[model samples]
Target: AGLSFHVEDMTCGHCAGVIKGAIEKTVPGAAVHADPASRTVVVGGVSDAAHIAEIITAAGYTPE
Candidate 1:
């Protein structure tokens, strides 16, 4: 399974885009798909969920 985070602060398209860009840049080969409507972020090609969580948090979103 991939990395999935329910971001409570990811409210709009910008939030999602920022997160996706940050994640992909931080972890090369990382594939990200964010659904703002559901507030869920699915990160592919990654194994460190904790690191990804930190990235999301740094982006000003809380992943629950």
Candidate 2:
């Protein structure tokens, strides 16, 4: 399964890496594709969307 969200604070590679790391850590083997410029994150794996949102929030971004 997969989840998609828009993160308004993502602005660069570091932000992308941070969010990517969080998502991947929460759901191992997950595929995370992020467009920093667009502030969007698309994740593929078995995960609870709200939980993933928390992970992103903890990583310093808001998942909407």
Candidate 3:
């Protein structure tokens, strides 16, 4: 399964990059996509969904 997060605080490319890096670190080889316009992020990988949420939150974004 995949995880989708509402990252309303992501305002620019840097925010996206940081979140992407966080997910990659926590869930190696994970596919991550962010939409600044929508303020959302979608992630797919073979890691536990809870951890994915933690990574997003640790990146300073809300994951819901």
Candidate 4:
């Protein structure tokens, strides 16, 4: 299973790291892949989309 979201704030490597850290901390063993060019974050090994979005939001990114 996987989840993906577009974040307007995800514009650089540092932003990606922050969002990745947030997701990984919230969902143990989850894999986070971020594309700064696309402003997209893809997460695997997680099922709850809402939870993932919430974590991303907490990381200071707007998930759409």
- Candidate 1 — which residues are off by over 4 angstroms? none
Q: Lowest summed-lDDT stretch of 10 residues in model 4?
A: 6-15
The local distance difference test score of each candidate is 0.85, 0.83, 0.80, 0.86
Q: TM-score of every model?
A: 0.87, 0.83, 0.82, 0.88
lDDT tens per residue, model 4, 9-62: 777898798888989888887789888998889998888899888888887788
lDDT of 1: 0.85
The number of clashing residue pairs in each candidate reads 0, 0, 0, 0
Best by TM-score: 4
Error of 3 at 41 (Å): 1.1
Off by over 4 Å in 4: none
Q: Which is the winner by lDDT between candidate 1 and candidate 2?
A: 1
Minimum summed lDDT over a 10-residue window in model 1 is located at 6-15
Better of 3 and 4 by TM-score: 4
Candidate number that wins on TM-score, 1 or 3: 1
lDDT of 2 by residue, 1-63 (tens): 788888877888887998898888877876888788778998887568888888888887878
* Model 2, C-alpha of 54: deviation from truth (Å): 1.2
The collision pairs in model 2 are: none
Candidate 2, lDDT over the whole model: 0.83
